[PDB]
Amino acid sequence: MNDSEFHRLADQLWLTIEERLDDWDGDSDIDCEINGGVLTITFENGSKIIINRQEPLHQVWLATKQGGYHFDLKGDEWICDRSGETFWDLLEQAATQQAGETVSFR
Ligand SMILES: [Eu+3]
Ligand SMILES: [Eu+3]
Ligand SMILES: [Eu+3]
Ligand SMILES: [Eu+3]
Ligand SMILES: [Eu+3]
């Protein structure tokens, strides 16, 4: 049921994030590491964005300089359980604010 579906969709999310930051071209230095399955993106100002799996809840969590956001699987989409906003939109907003330049995963 939900456990396999969660692993499938989260593994795809991890690869999309990693590959894009792998090919990051812009001026700002952005680094992405995977430690204990957790992704940590580090910006030149020392700020970070942290992305982890919450297995019991089948959620992906995002921790940014401004706050914490929790996402449910919704038809291949990841939706914030407090606001309805999409993961990609909230990640792009946070990364753009913390890099001081446009960061898109699209
Ligand atoms: Eu490549
Ligand atoms: Eu670097
Ligand atoms: Eu590195
Ligand atoms: Eu389970
Ligand atoms: Eu589909």
UniProtKB/Swiss-Prot annotation:
GO biological process terms, semicolon-separated: iron-sulfur cluster assembly
Q: Which SMART domains match?
A: Frataxin_Cyay
Q: What is the effect of changing W61R?
A: Increases kinetics of Fe-S formation on IscU
Tell me if Amino-acid biosynthesis is a UniProt keyword of this record: no
- Is Ubl conjugation found in the keyword set? no
User: What domain of life does the UniProt record list for this protein's source?
Assistant: Bacteria
Disrupted gene: phenotype observed? Cells are not affected in cellular iron content and sensitivity to oxidants.
Activity regulation text:
Binds iron under oxidative stress conditions, but not under conditions emulating the intracellular redox potential.
Q: Which GO terms describe its molecular function?
A: ferric iron binding; ferrous iron binding
The consequence of E18K is: Abolishes iron binding and increases kinetics of Fe-S formation on IscU
Keywords per UniProt: Iron, Metal-binding
Q: How does it assemble?
A: Monomer. Forms homodimers and higher oligomers in the presence of iron. Interacts with IscS.
Q: Which family does it belong to?
A: Belongs to the frataxin family.
Checking HAMAP family in the record gives:
CyaY
This molecule's function is given as: Involved in iron-sulfur (Fe-S) cluster assembly. May act as a regulator of Fe-S biogenesis. Can bind both Fe(2+) and Fe(3+) ions. In vivo, has a positive effect on Fe-S cluster biogenesis under iron-rich growth conditions. In vitro, can inhibit IscS cysteine desulfurase activity and the formation of Fe-S clusters on IscU. In vitro, in the presence of IscS and cysteine, Fe(3+)-CyaY can be used as an iron donor during Fe-S cluster assembly on the scaffold protein IscU.
Q: What is this protein called?
A: Iron-sulfur cluster assembly protein CyaY
Please give the organism.
Escherichia coli (strain K12)
Lineage, highest ranks first:
Bacteria, Pseudomonadati, Pseudomonadota, Gammaproteobacteria, Enterobacterales
